[PDB]
Symmetry: D3
Subunit: 182 residues, 6 copies
């Protein structure tokens, strides 16, 4: 019995492992939230002292609104459109992942606060001119919350400040790129 | 993208295989419903022509009441009580399994309708006699619905027939055993 | 005894999952038939209404003869030749796979009947031009049979239709491309 | 490529492992040939010097003959009958396995050549009085080839001499227990 | 990538899991120390308030001296004997694990101080009376330190209690059983 | 049982397998030494008669001294730089593995003596010109020992050739490439 329970606890734990190999969201072909969590930790510890990484939270403006008028299948093709447009804007080695139903998250290896600032505009503007095929959408905009990733940073804290920057960008009228501590 | 969805689908297929290894219900120490379903299927097929298996559905009486008066922990004890009791009654090589919240299911290889009825009464009276440690019980009874698994049966159908007999045994005033096609 | 057969059956289910991870054909470096079947199924389902995929069946001409004159090792080279060539022609994101001893199969996401016919000729002429290292070839050609995967198609049926076109292209005197429903 | 091949060679090797966990023949519920091979090695090395094990090859006399007259389903129920009868004759900790379509093999921990000799008669005679249910069989007999398992023995050699004893028992009229080096 | 980092940590996660499946000491056939640790967290948790388990630490007496006088293998044989013997003495469902080189550990489910003491005595004597074979050994004995595993208890603390109790019994002359909180 | 012995050896078999999936050096992102060994048996086998592969052993120059003067992390950074650099220089489909603490190994598929030498020179110079970032480092260089991997060759012998050639280049003054049978 106790033997069976220990045994089955082992198997469940294997299942958990298997579930970590499922590292990507099929819809958008980006990495999922949990795999990002695990990747970013790994990245933060590799950082030399006095070095930084780029980190941004990306939210699609009025996404929930698109679902009602255009139905759900449309709103998903919007999400796939962001993935496509982002894949095209981003350089190799940069980390993009799907952070929530409506949100994405970014990490840029060894990136300056100006490099940071630059990429987010490029992305954001590219979503404005974005043309999701087979869906006739009136408006397309995203807002960004940025910050940086210093050595000995705490991730839950690091994510809180980019979100702050993002929420402030959401009140700033949307289609806004806002930063925290540069 | 399709290779990814295919690959992660395999991943999930492996998770399900592992699931099928988690074959027992930890509270009782009995095989779970899913594992019973898989066993019974292969006992149905391995049936020689014009031969049979016994198959009863056991339900504990007023069990929900016990949970209400004595709390969910006593409910659990009662089930470990039944599990303990049943193992004293059954011959080595019988199949007994948890089937629902308070339902169990039995399968007796090559057992006459007489043999089955004999087994179930002995089980039924054994339960009635038992006392669970650390829980004072108004009293304990169970009902059973019985039937025979024939070669070329449908297992879902066979099962439907014992549930019919279990329904009548409940209706008859509980603590009894009814049958269908013997 | 049934628990054993159930348990070992799971075991064999795991062996088959692992099988589905062995997704490529080592000689060519292309995806194998089984993996193609699993990919195409999910490309069929992911098809929006009134949209299509291209789908051709490629067969190399007089291949068996090459094995007879030049020996089974040259036969293999010719296939690595075709595999190399094809990868030069195809856009990133096409699906190409080994389908038989000498048969290959192609799938072009969102590709017009025009687009498909254009791709296949370019492939066809590219093969004709090629020379495999260390093997002197009388000459090289391939035939192809093409069709369109529609939403609500049957994949077996779709496939049956390209094999019909491939049959005619062989009949037409080889080194050509026939189609069915465009 | 080479990377893919190394990778897929890894997976095939896992499959091989999985295949070693499938350690038992379902029909007779005994261990299969390969698991016996692996078990006996393990047992031979554990042996103290000047210590022995029992080893016997068991063949059912005229088994192929039963298949013709009584059809295959009968001959299998004979095999299951031997497994049953053997399970009953044998003590706990003794190793019985299915060695071939018609043959079985035995190992007895720390067994004397007289203990050896004794068990094989008990088994053999018990198969004479054996009554395979649902099959009307005229005759039931097996022959045995025995030997022993000394320290630093070679298994392929150890199995050759018990077979010799067995083949000699097959010519000795069948229903014969013959030994090699006691 | 850092992705790569993550994916290999997962595989490493898996090996550890697979390691937890190797649950038993190969020399004796008992559960090993790690598997016991996990089985015993799980009993400690499943413990009703005002109820408890039996815990004992069993150390064989003058084992080191046995190795010197009779040789490493003879020592190993003595270990076997203790397992054999204990298997005889133990009610079904008692947990016996190898805890170290010459020390064991026993959990008794729902056992009384009085019940624990009776078991260790029956065990202490039985081992005294034993004769391993090979191996003639002049005399054997063990000493036992006991305690009770209550709810809200620390399992490592529980073991400290048992350890200390085992020390007093070694100090008190061996072939005895001391205890702590009974 | 001995059965138990067998079953845990199988699990042990599995861990080893899982270990072969950890194929890449986490610091550099290159294949590790074991994965290379396996990739290279497989190329050696797939080699047509009178045909061959390129083999080189790359050792960074005065690495130990770098660690002492700039610190362990700086050394580690230099290793990264070499990977980055080599990735740029290498045709797609070249095999580069980390072979040791400061040494690499390169297989070139179907490469000429002349082709190998050209690659190592382009590599030797490129690394000379490089600037890791962090990290200011006064100067970098490596030395290269080369040979050809023929059919019917021993891969360990091939490596001996390369090793020796690497020694002559260290001895000859470093920042060079010696060779053995070209």
């Amino acid at each position: 019995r106790y033997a069976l329970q220990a045994h089955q606890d082992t198997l469940r734990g294997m299942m958990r492992q298997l579930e970590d190999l499922v590292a990507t969201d099929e819809l958008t072909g980006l990495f999922n939230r949990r795999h990002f969590m695990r990747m970013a930790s790994r990245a933060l510890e590799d950082l030399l002292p006095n070095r930084q990484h780029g980190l941004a939270l990306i939210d699609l403006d009025h996404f929930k609104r698109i679902n009602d008028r255009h139905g759900h299948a449309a709103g998903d093709r919007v999400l796939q459109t962001f993935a496509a447009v982002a894949r095209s804007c981003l350089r190799d080695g940069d980390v993009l992942a799907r952070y929530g139903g409506e949100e994405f998250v970014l990490l840029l290896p060894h990136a300056d606060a100006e490099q940071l600032e630059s990429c987010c505009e490029r992305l954001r503007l590219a979503f404005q001119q974005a043309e999701p095929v087979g869906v006739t959408v009136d408006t397309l905009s995203l807002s960004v919350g940025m910050t940086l990733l210093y050595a000995d940073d705490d991730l839950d804290e690091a994510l809180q400040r980019a979100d702050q920057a993002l929420y402030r960008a959401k009140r700033g009228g949307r289609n806004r790129c806002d930063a925290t501590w540069e």
